[PDB]
């Protein structure tokens, strides 16, 4: 299972490390906020006026756990892995 900390694909495309785990004011169930290696991401960690973490602007994503691996398994649109 998915921890903070982990190294992880987003989307099986983007990589980065996985900085907040929980429950958000934008959506249902639990979502992943990761800052990605590369500024591919959205975000900086915050929506609509909640933070969930910082980061470095563009380098924010959140996901579902469903659309997040962790680097070396599957994923699963071209994807790393």
Same mark, same amino acid.
């Given at each position: 299972e998915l921890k903070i900390g982990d190294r992880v694909l987003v989307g099986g495309t983007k990589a980065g490390v996985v900085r907040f785990l929980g429950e958000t004011d934008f959506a249902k169930g639990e979502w992943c906020g990761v800052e990605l290696?590369?500024?591919? !991401?959205?975000?900086? !960690?915050?929506?609509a006026g909640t933070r969930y973490f910082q980061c470095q602007p563009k380098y924010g994503l959140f996901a579902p756990v469903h659309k997040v691996t962790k680097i070396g398994f599957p994923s699963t649109v071209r994807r790393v892995m």
């Amino acid at each position: 299972e998915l921890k903070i900390g982990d190294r992880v694909l987003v989307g099986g495309t983007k990589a980065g490390v996985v900085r907040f785990l929980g429950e958000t004011d934008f959506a249902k169930g639990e979502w992943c906020g990761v800052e990605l290696d590369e500024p591919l !991401g959205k975000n900086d !960690g915050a929506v609509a006026g909640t933070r969930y973490f910082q980061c470095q602007p563009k380098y924010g994503l959140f996901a579902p756990v469903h659309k997040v691996t962790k680097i070396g398994f599957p994923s699963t649109v071209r994807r790393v892995m």
